[PDB]
Amino acid sequence: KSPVFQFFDWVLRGTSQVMFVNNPLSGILIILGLFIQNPWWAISGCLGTIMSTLTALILSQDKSAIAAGFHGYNGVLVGLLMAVFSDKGDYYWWLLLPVIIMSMSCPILSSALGTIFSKWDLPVFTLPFNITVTLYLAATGHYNLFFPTTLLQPASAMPNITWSEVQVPLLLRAIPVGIGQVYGCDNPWTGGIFLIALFISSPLICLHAAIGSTMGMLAALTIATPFDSIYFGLCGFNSTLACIAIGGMFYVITWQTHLLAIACALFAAYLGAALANMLSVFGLPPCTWPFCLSALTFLLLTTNNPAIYKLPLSKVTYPEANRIYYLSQER
Amino acid sequence: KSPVFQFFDWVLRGTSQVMFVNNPLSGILIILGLFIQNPWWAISGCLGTIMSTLTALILSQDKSAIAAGFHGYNGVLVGLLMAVFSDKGDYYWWLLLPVIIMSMSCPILSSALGTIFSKWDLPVFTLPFNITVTLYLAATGHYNLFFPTTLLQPASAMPNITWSEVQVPLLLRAIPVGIGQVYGCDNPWTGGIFLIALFISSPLICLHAAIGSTMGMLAALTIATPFDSIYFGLCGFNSTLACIAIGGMFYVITWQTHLLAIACALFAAYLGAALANMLSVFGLPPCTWPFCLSALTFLLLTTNNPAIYKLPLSKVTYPEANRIYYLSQER
Amino acid sequence: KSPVFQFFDWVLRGTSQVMFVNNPLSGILIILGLFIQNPWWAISGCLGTIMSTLTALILSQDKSAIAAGFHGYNGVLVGLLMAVFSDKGDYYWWLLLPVIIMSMSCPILSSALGTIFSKWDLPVFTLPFNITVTLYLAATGHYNLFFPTTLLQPASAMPNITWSEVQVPLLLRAIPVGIGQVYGCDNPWTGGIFLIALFISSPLICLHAAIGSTMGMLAALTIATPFDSIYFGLCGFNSTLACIAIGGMFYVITWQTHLLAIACALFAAYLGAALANMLSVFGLPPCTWPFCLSALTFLLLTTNNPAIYKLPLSKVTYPEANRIYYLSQER
Ligand SMILES: COc1ccc(C)cc1S(=O)(=O)Nc1ccc(Cl)c(N2CCCS2(=O)=O)c1
Ligand SMILES: COc1ccc(C)cc1S(=O)(=O)Nc1ccc(Cl)c(N2CCCS2(=O)=O)c1
Ligand SMILES: COc1ccc(C)cc1S(=O)(=O)Nc1ccc(Cl)c(N2CCCS2(=O)=O)c1
Secondary structure, eight states: OOHHHHHHHHHHHHHHHTTTOOOHHHHHHHHHHHHHHOHHHHHHHHHHHHHHHHHHHHTTOOHHHHHTTTTHHHHHHHHHHHHHTBTTOTTOGGGHHHHHHHHHHHHHHHHHHHHHHTTTTOOOOSHHHHHHHHHHHHHHOTTOSSSOBOOOOOOOSOOOOOGGGOOHHHHHHHHHHHHHTTTTOOOHHHHHHHHHHHHHHOHHHHHHHHHHHHHHHHHHHHTTOOHHHHHTTTTSHHHHHHHHIIIIISBOOOHHHHHHHHHHHHHHHHHHHHHHHHHTTTTOOOOSHHHHHHHHHHHSOOOSSTTSOBOOGGGOOOHHHHHHHHHHHHO | OOHHHHHHHHHHHHHHHTTTOOOHHHHHHHHHHHHHHOHHHHHHHHHHHHHHHHHHHHTTOOHHHHHTTTTHHHHHHHHHHHHHTBTTOTTOGGGHHHHHHHHHHHHHHHHHHHHHHTTTTOOOOSHHHHHHHHHHHHHHOTTOSSSOBOOOOOOOSOOOOOGGGOOHHHHHHHHHHHHHTTTTOOOHHHHHHHHHHHHHHOHHHHHHHHHHHHHHHHHHHHTTOOHHHHHTTTTSHHHHHHHHIIIIISBOOOHHHHHHHHHHHHHHHHHHHHHHHHHTTTTOOOOSHHHHHHHHHHHSOOOSSTTSOBOOGGGOOOHHHHHHHHHHHHO | OOHHHHHHHHHHHHHHHTTTOOOHHHHHHHHHHHHHHOHHHHHHHHHHHHHHHHHHHHTTOOHHHHHTTTTHHHHHHHHHHHHHTBTTOTTOGGGHHHHHHHHHHHHHHHHHHHHHHTTTTOOOOSHHHHHHHHHHHHHHOTTOSSSOBOOOOOOOSOOOOOGGGOOHHHHHHHHHHHHHTTTTOOOHHHHHHHHHHHHHHOHHHHHHHHHHHHHHHHHHHHTTOOHHHHHTTTTSHHHHHHHHIIIIISBOOOHHHHHHHHHHHHHHHHHHHHHHHHHTTTTOOOOSHHHHHHHHHHHSOOOSSTTSOBOOGGGOOOHHHHHHHHHHHHO
8 A cells, every 4th residue: 555545554553542442433333433523623623633643653663553553542642632722713824833843752752651661561551641631731721822722720619510401412522521531522422433433443442431521420410529520421431441442452351350440440540530620720731641640540450359360461452352361371 | 156146246346446556455446446536437337347347258358358348447546537537527427328338438448458468468447448438538629519528728827836835735635646646536534545446465566656647746846746636636646557557566676676666656756747738738637558658668668677577468467476475486 | 088078079069060070070069150140149159058968978878879979969959949039138047957957858758769760771960959959938928937938930921022122142141141040149240150061071961051051041031931031041951951961872873863952942942931830820930840851851752763772871981982882882
């Protein structure tokens, strides 16, 4: 195939690696979902992925890592979440100038954290996106002349919650919306598209995504989160990412590991509330910080029983193949 | 003995492991002190210890670690410091619902940090409690509908300190109160009870606790801390914990190590002031963060002279036995 | 030579090691620059260096490290930046009391971080100064009775920038001022003196310092930084330090490494804006935090091509000798 087609294949795998799937068709579906939700965000995310993969090539990173989309999955989130939190509205073309530059900083961090994490056979997952986007949103801020960001300020009043006005249909619809909020999209249709794309590659990832999103919603209800945040899906994207990560990918899937994944989703939801309340002091949002922190603290956990088995990163692919390999190695 | 008696022995050792003592009688004395100060806080702390040890058993952690109370010493602090910082007052039974849940997160972190720290033969001491309680207090906050917390806000005015109104008797009484503030208790009687419990196991721990508390008070006076904070003992619990840790436990006790412990107590007091001023921006208090940070930065210190000897964690028990073992190994 | 002369030689090398030069004459020039800018700041910095080296001797640190000034280069910054951010004005002699004490905490941290960093052959450069000065400025704060600090508060209004009023001469003069801002000095003459001192030891360090300062200024212009910050040099000292570090010292100097250094300078400038906006919430300034973070994240970067070569710390001296050694080893 032509090198351009290979590069676009890498970009398509990267845009889907956010949800822990390496599949070009799922990447196409996710791109279609992003364009369904907001074309400007899709353009910004595609530019972020392209520039992140180009910087990975320029910095002479491992070709296998680039071909698997391990470097493009942070540029998409950087571009999408810098277009989401822009106060200048849609099609502010100047926003593409930082979207490029900060995307170039994703492979660098991706490499740096790797050097830190290879000591513990620990994955650095979406952590560079968090650092890069926190850097950008703090550098610019809401009071910037060129690239202002939306205003986030800490809660200063007791919320008015009427539990007789809760809508169970929207509370359930927060599951696909929570799935879609991983990329920053709040449209229910793009959330359903993301669920379909997850199911194409591996059904276990889709099941764990739905379970993580519903656990994030349930954990948000238990601390009296305002219903607007829950309906918007803002309370269940760290949880779905954590449930996907600990569910059957980085651990061999088992009922013990399923319960561990549910516990990690709950912990990620509570850490998401904590970090949303803390980072909002600086005006910054919780952008996948809770997922990274909780997934790291649940992958470093050492447990004696043989059911909770952590796979070497070299052999992690997708949960069903992970289980097949584990049984092949045991026998 | 019956398994229930063994479990309660583990809980009693855990409730005393906060002050670095593994002794069921000292645990009983500390529980009696907590009940003397506030029965509700004692109930919350006991529930925290019970659920932390139960989660350690469920997660199939090392049985020797559980039997020594290495997992129950974080649940007690989580429960106590979540009951202390509750705005709903005494006997708010719903507060036991998070006290359980967050306690379950203490062994997990305890394991995770262990995996991080075993590379440097470094102890993770009370660090999970800090993370868990900071998570809870940030997630809920003072403006929560269900579990509101007490309001902490950064200093915005120059304090009015009259040095002619300082009370030397209360300034001295801040030593036992500073000892008792480790568990969150401000009663002088429970501080004296804690000192007695420390002396039961090993006199060196009691001496280093008193020295650390008085160093925290003295260091707080040097930066013009308001006398109300000093009298309340809020300025000398990180210092006493750091002095206990570096005094004769994790280092072999020597006059060089005694001076190192005093320096660590001073550094922990100053870091406590810094973190109390910084974390109060988010509304969070300094909950043993300074002790952990200063003890880590004083245990990683490399010093050429043979007097400052750091013991492998496998053989740290209590300062007198530590010294006896060190002389046995040298000769 | 007499031991006093040896100790003052160590102090002179330490006061210049901030800019990554080990040369007593450059140390004398830098001290002369500090006295040119403000004699009180020079006295505070000299006391900081003296007490940091004395604590390094007391704590029985490596004599080769002390002789090379590897321990005095943090006391100078601690003293200088605690005298800079004092609200009591010039010749407040009581300020020397903490300048001593916090200086004693520089070797300790210097050792501790070393134990953390030797696993990755990673340098701890100016990181203890950041921790110590952040500790001091947070503990005291602007509302302290004894040692108040200057008030820094987050931006709460959109800045009024008139691009027709920009002064190219001052914008260029921000290069030597940016060089001098490493020590906290804003005088153009002391910046020129620092550039001369850098050129005495090794011209590559001077060139990379100027390039880093101009990259910091250019990166500050791109996010609409107020011109007062740029003219003052506050936007280009982290950048010049990062450019010096990654330029030819810790990497073998090459055009690939030159571009890497320029990229690191840009990243350090943007991280400096981010941390200036974030830390100002607590009232703290960005004091070489961006340099440390960006230099660490660019020294952990793993790159396949042989041009980007990282030197073992044992053999890093100065960029020209680094290149000479690398070619000697290759052939
Ligand atoms: C979706 O994220 C993941 C999904 C699945 C795997 C196997 C890991 C990750 S990750 O979290 O570690 N991200 C990430 C970023 C950059 C590189 Cl270079 C890599 N890898 C290169 C080869 C081995 S690797 O360690 O897989 C992973
Ligand atoms: C009071 O805290 C301490 C007092 C005395 C010792 C020997 C350590 C600690 S600690 O700070 O490291 N906490 C802690 C938490 C969980 C476990 Cl599993 C353990 N340990 C299991 C066995 C070896 S261990 O490393 O002792 C220690
Ligand atoms: C200007 O800073 C640097 C410039 C040049 C070198 C070789 C490192 C540094 S540094 O950033 O690592 N600081 C620093 C602080 C304390 C000590 Cl003890 C040391 N070192 C002792 C000997 C080997 S070492 O690792 O060089 C370095």
